[PDB]
Structures are given as C-alpha cells and as structure tokens.
Design a binder for this molecule. Structure first.
Ligand SMILES: O=C1c2ccccc2C(=O)N1CCOC(=S)Nc1ccc(I)cc1
Lengths: 395, 544
C-alpha cells in the first residue's frame, strides 16, 4: 500500500536495452508466464509513449521468467547501495553450513512507486519479427532489481525478528532475491532450523554451502626427481611470474643452474634450499593483499582441459583476494557453472559479485549462456584472450 | 475518417515547453494552396481553427499542391517512443499460405486521433498576403505527417484495433508494414475473399478504409528488395548490363547487388571485386578490371543465368545447415529441410582477428549461422561440416578458449578443414636447440635478429625499420631456416609464443605467413618460453 518513492539517479535516464532473440520454446513459456502475472495484477501492458526496455529470458532452475536489470541497477545504484544498502556480515563466510533460500517470490506483495514503473519495461519478442512484440511493465517490486530488497527490508526484518531472537547465533544475509542463512550446528540440526525458518516465511535444506571449509588453491611446483633443462626452465618460468605475487620468491639459485633442451642435470644442494622455502610460501596466504570495499571485484577464469577450470579474484591485476578450481557436459556448460559457483562464493564473502573475464567468443556465450544458467542474478562479464602462460602458471 | 480508438498520452520532454518559431511569409499562390488544402482538411476534421493565442507555432509551407509543416522544433521537444524498428521478418522464416492479399490504408496518420492535451502544441499559421493581417490559426486533431510519435502511435493503434479480429480468426495471418496490411491464409480463393471483406468491414468500423477491388493484392509482391509468392520467395530481379568501363560507383553497386542476391543464389563471389575498391578511391575513377575478377563477374552472371527461388519453412521438420570451404577466408552455406530444396543461402568472409586457422573460422561460421537461424526460425539447425569429428575434438580439447557447436556430423565435400601442423608437447630429443632473441632501437627504428645454439652456431641478420616485436618473429623465423627437419626453439617473447602456439594457418602479416609455410615442412617443432633479461643459460648469450 504505502509506496517508497523511488528516484532514478538525478540526471541519468531510463534503460534502453534491446531484447535478445529467443527460441520459440522459451517465448511460448514467457507468454504463459506473463499472462498469469498480469491476470493477477503484477504487470500491465504499455503503449509506445514508453521508450524504455530491459531484456528477459527463460530459465528452468518448470520455466521461470528472468529479467536482466544489470543496466537499471547501474543507474539506480545510489538508491539501493548508499540509500538503502544492506550491510554484509563477515561471520557468514565462517560458518560450517550456509543454505541459500529463494525468497524473491515475495516482492510481489509490495507495490512499486508509480512514477518509477516505466523504467521496468520489458519486451516479449516474436519469431522472425512476424508480430510487433508484447510490451509490459511491473506494478510491484520486480525480482531481479537491487531496489527490491532495499525497499523490502522493513518487512524482511519484522519477519525475521522472532526467528533471530530465538536463534541469536544464526547469521542471515540478504542479497537480491536470496537469503543466506548459516550456522555452526551439526548437519541435521541446521536443516531443522531451516525448515523451522521456512515456516516463518510461509506466513508472509535446499542448497548446502560449506564456506568455513574453503581454502586457498596453492600454486604447486613439480616434485620430479631427475629434472631437465626444459623442466628447470619452466620451473623458474612460473617462479618468475610468482615473483609478481607472494613477496619473497627467489629464483636466483635455480636460475644459476648454450645447453641442449633435453639435457638432464642434477640440481644443486643449494637448489633445494630455494624451491623448499618457495614451497613453504605460496601455500601460505599472500602478504599485503586486502579487500577494498570501494573497489569492484574482478574474476578471471582459464580453461585447464579435462573438465578442469582454475580461477582468481582480485581488484588489482595480480594481487589475489582468492583463487580456486572447479571440476552432457560441454565447454560452455561447464563455464556457466563455474561462473555461478564463483559468484555465490564472492557474495558470501564480500556481498558483491565480481566482474568476469570470459575465455570465450562473445557471440558463442551470448547464444548459449542461458541454456544452463540457474541463478536469478547476472554478473557483469567481459571477453578476453587467455594469455598462454597465465593458464599454465595456475595449472 | 477519424478512428474512435482511445488516444495515446503524449508529453513534452522533462522541463521543456511547446515550440514557437515564426512564419517565413510565403508567395501569393502558396498562400492560396495552403488555404484550399487546410479548408478541406478542416472539413475532414483533421484540423481546427484555434482561437485565443496559443503562444506555440511551427512553420508551414507548400510544395508543388501539398502542404508540408516543419516539425523539427516540436520534434526535439517531444518525448521518446518505443522503437518501431526492431527487425523485419526474413521471407525464409515465413510459413506457406494458400491465399495472400494486400490491403493498403489510405490517410493513416490522418485517420488516427492525436492526444487532445497535446494538440495545442501543433499550432501553425497560414500567412496573410504579406505580414499584414494575423492569419488563419490551426492545430492538429490527428497524427501530423512530419511528427515523431506518428509512426509509433499509428503502429500501436493498428494493433489494438486489429487484435479483436485476430482473436476471432487465429488461423489467419496479418502483417503490418507502414501503410499496408498483408493478409495470408490457407483458405481457398472463394472463401478467402469473404474473410477479407469481413476484415475491411471490421477495419471500417474503426475508421480505416481500404481498397475495394483495387486490392494491390495478387502475388508477385515487392517488399524490401524481395519478391514474394504465396508458395515461394526470391530476391528482387537484378540486371548487370554490358560495360567496358567500371567506376568505383559502378562496382560499388555491383558488390551490393551481388551481396543481396547471395541470400538465395548459391555460390556468389565478390572477393575479387572487393579488391578493386582497395585504396582511397574517388567515386568517379575508372578502375580496370583485373583477371581474377574479369572471370568472377561472368561466373556470377552465370549462376544468375536462370532465376532461383527459396522455399518456406515447415515447423515440423529439422533444419539442415551445411557449409562449404570456398577459397581463402571465404565460406558459404545453405539451409534446407528436404535435401537441396533451399530455404535460404548465405556466405561468410571476414577476419576481425590478426591470425586465424580454418578450424576457428569454421566455428565462427557455425556460430553466425546459429544466431541467424535463431532469430529466423526460433530453433537451431543440424549441421553438416567439412571437418572430421576427430580433427575437431583434438583442437576442441587442446585449445584455451571455450566452444560449443550444436548437433553436427561429418560430410566429405572437399576441400576439408584441418590443422596444417602440430607443435610438439615435449622437448625433442637429439635435435638442435635454438636460443633466439631480438632487439631494436626505439629511436633508430632498427634492430638485430639472431640466435645461438647448443652446438656452437651463431647468427644475426640485421634488420632496418622494424618494431621491437618483428625482431622476435624474425628470429624464430631465422631459426626455422638454418635448422633441420626437426627442432626446438626458445624465446623470451610471449607475443610470438601465443601467435605460433595457436596453430595459425593464415595471417595478415607477411612475416607470420613465412613462419607458417616453414612450420609445415618440418617434422617436429617445439617452442618453449623463458623470462627475458633474467640471464637464463642460452637466452643470455643471444641477448648480448
Ligand atoms: O504476410 C506476411 C508478410 C508479407 C510480406 C513480408 C512479411 C510478411 C509477414 O511476416 N507476413 C505474415 C506471415 O506470412 C506468412 S506466415 N506467410 C506468407 C505471407 C505472405 C506471403 I506473399 C507468403 C507467405
């Protein structure tokens, strides 16, 4: 009833993003969706006097509508972030178990500031442009808009008030459409608290995450036991790159050991003293790297072949906040999953999504990414030319 | 007439007011034309004599007799509308219909009501025989010709009013393009004509009048460069008369016409004709037609000898897309449902990248076809490619970039796509090791490209006027020359490693193209990388 005045950042203008071509099957599923939604007053047809647009897709998870408010969000950030921003607890990441609950389907209660509805306009396209295309706008909090949770906090806090009080050691975090609720309780106990929580939500298990048990992806060096020029050359090679991270790495003694490539040579007693210590480092956390809440997070992913994928997250090239790995599967299917996993962890850790650098062709990603996507958010992404040696130094 | 359709609320931009530019008095006659015209329109209800003093006004003038209002000012001050230009169906995406008809709407813009609260903004004046007496004031009651919301509000109107009939006749197909309506159906002529009068009559109930028996209807239709029959489609007829002299202008238009035709005409070539355009070209210079092109024009003329039509789409049948390697960089493809009865034809010939190999290009083509097939048919085609599934998985697996082709299968239409060489994954045993490197003065713009060996050898061809990078591919090149059929090379240049490490088989760089051919003659090559200025045995010696 009571609407919260929503104002697009002074100056900036609505989003005007074109709709991506969709497959017949998804289109069909969107209309059926968008027919029910207007039938129950969640969205309304609109006319040409509305020059705005945001893209929509269909995912399965039973189809589900998914709007890409990436742009609208970038143009209202002041609202959701510095106006009604939700604080992120550092405790979440420390709990044995974290469950992710889909609570999006509740924004449809609260109405949206009429004066703001025209920015939430989207389009359902048609095959081969044989018909104009069905235009809509939301008349209630839309699911993928960072503004919704912002506006929906008073209700959310009241709903949780009791549960929290009766369970003062449970951390509950909200980030777009989702609740992250973690605890240090034993398996079964945790799941009982989640079910006991779901019931609270009702009057207005599912996804087992285990963050506390997340640790660095240590850059390892070959064990070997014979070593060759090539071997030691590659060995120092990555030791060089590592030099740019992990202060202390010393390739000097190695590098001091014309000659054929396939010529086996015995390291120097002094040699082991090097990669030994260098080994002891790399496994220990980086020194001097700190998350800066005002800087955006970057994420690179490289393809390791064999269904393996490595990844780093950072705010400044080469200084890593975190690195890890991920194991009908195809390149694009595995990569989509990688992107989903890394993002969940980012949110759990910093309360924000990283901007992705994708080792793929823009068109190829754009054609397929939706096929395997399941999350209800969409991170920013870029497309890059995986540096040949960068892939190898993280193997 | 004027449709009773509810209007669309129009508004001016954020903080702007109605326009107010003054009238450049006209000439005796133009004044007379304007009065005759307005009076009629005025009788039609399209306009109204405005009283008091609307401070707003937009210029008006006559052209020979018709009236053109200058709308820039009001336009700029008018809001933005939902784009009416999102895409236009490709004929190959159309289902087959038994009967087609085309009704054109007369006085469309003028038959649709403007928003009353906005009418006041469209005020104009017919001058007096010379800035003496006020003049006849007029505002619009309907969408004005030059206004920016007209195309949009019209298309929205025509849809809202067309919605009810569609709903009571879902089996029927109607497409609106500007001032026309194409109506198709599977009804037999007799019964189809009834269905149309039913439309016209529904359309009249809403203020839109149509051609009685003038129905421009009755196929061979000309729409957006296409020729449309109810059963088949093709591109609009194109001639290429004889000429002994070709201007940039001429071959421009030829290239364009060729490209358009290549949409249904299999095997259209314009690569050789595109060269002739290379260089800063004055549109009126005669350009002698080279040999490679001399023939290409007539072999084009040849395939355009007998007309060709594409078929329409059958929703209950897989699409088949097959692709053909055709010359260098050039690719071609066809799309059909029943073997060799094409729906549409096409080609792909580009670069966007500095260095590339057939296997990558093939994938790019498949990609482009994949998204073209989506927008048109709403589903993905089944592919037939000139590549062994094995030779695809190898590359697929080893490459550092992700990929994913839809369902495909091998087809032996030479030439076949393949890698022209494979770099060793492990150091070669008992074969010259070449520590190579390059240099260059950033000021003198010259440098030395050399190499040293595990066998004593040493060189250094000096180069004049090369960047700091060339003298790195030059070195690797030099090494691939003085070495035997079997070798391994050490660089400190990741620039060169990346290039060669992706098995290029063609590049827009004469140096890289040489290194290529060289890589194809060897029987084993291994390229390893070591840090620069890190005094590594071998690299250092060559650095000196
Ligand atoms: O009638 C048209 C038409 C005519 C010209 C250009 C585009 C178009 C269209 O989308 N529609 C609606 C769909 O038409 C369909 S499904 N099939 C047709 C329509 C017209 C014709 I001639 C041949 C086949």
């Amino acid at each position: 009833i009571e609407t919260v005045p929503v104002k697009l950042k002074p100056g900036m203008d609505g989003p005007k993003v074109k709709q991506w071509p969709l497959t017949e099957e998804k289109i069909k599923a969107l209309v059926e969706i968008c027919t029910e939604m207007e039938k129950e007053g969640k969205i309304s047809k609109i006319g040409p006097e509305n020059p705005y647009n945001t893209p929509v897709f269909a995912i399965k998870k039973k189809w589900r509508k998914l709007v890409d408010f990436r742009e609208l969000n970038k143009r209202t950030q002041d609202f959701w972030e510095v106006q009604l921003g939700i604080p992120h607890p550092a405790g979440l990441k420390k709990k044995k178990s974290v469950t992710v609950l889909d609570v999006g389907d509740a924004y449809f209660s609260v109405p949206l500031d009429e004066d703001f509805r025209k920015y939430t306009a989207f389009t359902i396209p048609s095959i081969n442009n044989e018909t104009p295309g069905i235009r809509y706008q939301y008349n209630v909090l839309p699911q993928g808009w960072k503004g919704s949770p912002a506006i929906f906090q008073s209700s959310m806090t009241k709903i949780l008030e009791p549960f929290k009080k009766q369970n003062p050691d449970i951390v509950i975090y909200q980030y777009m459409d989702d609740l992250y609720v973690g605890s240090d309780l034993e398996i079964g106990q945790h799941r009982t608290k989640i079910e006991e929580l779901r019931q609270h939500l009702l009057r207005w298990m599912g996804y087992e995450l285990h963050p506390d048990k997340w640790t660095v992806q240590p850059i390892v060096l070959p064990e070997k036991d014979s070593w060759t020029v090539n071997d030691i050359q590659k060995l120092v090679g990555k030791l060089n790159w590592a030099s740019q991270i992990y202060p202390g790495i010393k390739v000097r003694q190695l590098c001091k050991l014309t000659k054929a490539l396939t010529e086996v040579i015995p390291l120097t007693e002094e040699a082991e003293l090097e990669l030994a210590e260098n080994r002891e480092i790399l496994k220990e956390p980086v020194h001097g790297v700190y998350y800066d809440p005002s800087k955006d997070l970057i994420a690179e992913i490289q393809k390791q072949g064999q269904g393996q994928w490595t990844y780093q997250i950072y705010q400044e090239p080469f200084k890593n906040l975190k690195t890890g790995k991920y194991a009908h599967t195809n390149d694009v299917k595995q990569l989509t999953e990688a992107v989903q996993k890394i993002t969940t962890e980012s949110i759990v850790i910093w309360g924000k999504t990283p901007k992705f650098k994708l080792p793929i062709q823009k068109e190829t990603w754009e054609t397929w990414w939706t096929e395997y996507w399941q999350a209800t958010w969409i991170p920013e992404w870029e497309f890059v030319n995986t540096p040949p040696l960068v892939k190898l130094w993280y193997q | 007439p004027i449709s009773p359709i509810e209007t669309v609320p129009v508004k001016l931009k954020p903080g702007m007011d109605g326009p107010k530019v003054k009238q450049w008095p006209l000439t005796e006659e133009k004044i007379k034309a304007l009065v005759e015209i307005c009076t009629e329109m005025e009788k039609e209800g399209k306009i109204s004599k405005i009283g008091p003093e609307n401070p707003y006004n937009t210029p008006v003038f006559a052209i020979k007799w018709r009236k053109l209002v200058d709308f820039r000012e009001l336009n700029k001050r008018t809001q933005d509308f939902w784009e009416v230009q999102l895409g236009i169906p490709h004929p190959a995406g159309l289902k087959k219909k038994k009967s087609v008809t085309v009704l054109d709407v007369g006085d469309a813009y003028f038959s649709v009501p403007l928003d009353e609260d906005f009418r006041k903004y469209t005020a104009f004046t017919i001058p007096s025989i010379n800035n003496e007496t006020p003049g006849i004031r007029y505002q619009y009651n309907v969408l004005p010709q030059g206004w920016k919301g007209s195309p949009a509000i019209f298309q929205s109107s025509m849809t809202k009013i067309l919605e009810p009939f569609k709903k009571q006749n879902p089996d029927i197909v109607i497409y609106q393009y500007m001032d026309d309506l194409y109506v198709g159906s599977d009804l037999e002529i007799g019964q189809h004509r009834t269905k149309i009068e039913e439309l016209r009559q529904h359309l009249l109930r809403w203020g839109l009048t149509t051609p009685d028996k003038k129905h421009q209807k009755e196929p061979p239709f000309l729409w957006m460069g296409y020729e449309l029959h109810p059963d088949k489609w093709t591109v609009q007829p194109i001639v290429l008369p004889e000429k002994d002299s070709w201007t940039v202008n001429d071959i421009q238009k030829l290239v364009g016409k060729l490209n358009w035709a290549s949409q249904i005409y299999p095997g259209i070539k314009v690569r050789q004709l595109c060269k002739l355009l290379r260089g800063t070209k004055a549109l009126t210079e005669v350009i002698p037609l080279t040999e490679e092109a001399e023939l290409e024009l007539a072999e084009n003329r040849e395939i355009l000898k007998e007309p060709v039509h594409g078929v329409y789409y059958d929703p209950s049948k897989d699409l088949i897309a097959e692709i053909q390697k055709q010359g260098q960089g050039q690719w071609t493809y066809q799309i059909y449902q029943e073997p060799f009865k094409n729906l549409k034809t096409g080609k792909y010939a580009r670069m966007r990248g500095a260095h590339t190999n057939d296997v990558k290009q093939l994938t790019e083509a498949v990609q482009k076809i994949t998204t073209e097939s989506i927008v048109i048919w709403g589903k993905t085609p089944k592919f037939k490619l000139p590549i062994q599934k094995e030779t695809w998985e190898t590359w697929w697996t080893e490459y550092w970039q992700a990929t994913w082709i839809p369902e495909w299968e091998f087809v032996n239409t030479p030439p076949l796509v393949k890698l022209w060489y494979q770099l060793e994954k492990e150091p070669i045993v008992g074969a010259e090791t070449f520590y190579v490197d390059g240099a260059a003065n950033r000021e003198t713009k010259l440098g030395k490209a050399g190499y040293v060996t595990n066998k004593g050898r040493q060189k250094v061809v000096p180069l004049t006027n090369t960047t700091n990078q060339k003298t790195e591919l030059q070195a690797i090149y030099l090494a691939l020359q003085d070495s035997g059929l079997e070798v391994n090379i050490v660089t400190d240049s990741q620039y060169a490693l990346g290039i060669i490490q992706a098995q290029p088989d063609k590049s827009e760089s004469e140096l890289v193209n040489q290194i290529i051919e060289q890589l194809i003659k060897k029987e084993k090559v291994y390229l390893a990388w070591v840090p620069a200025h890190k005094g590594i045995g071998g690299n250092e010696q060559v650095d000196k």
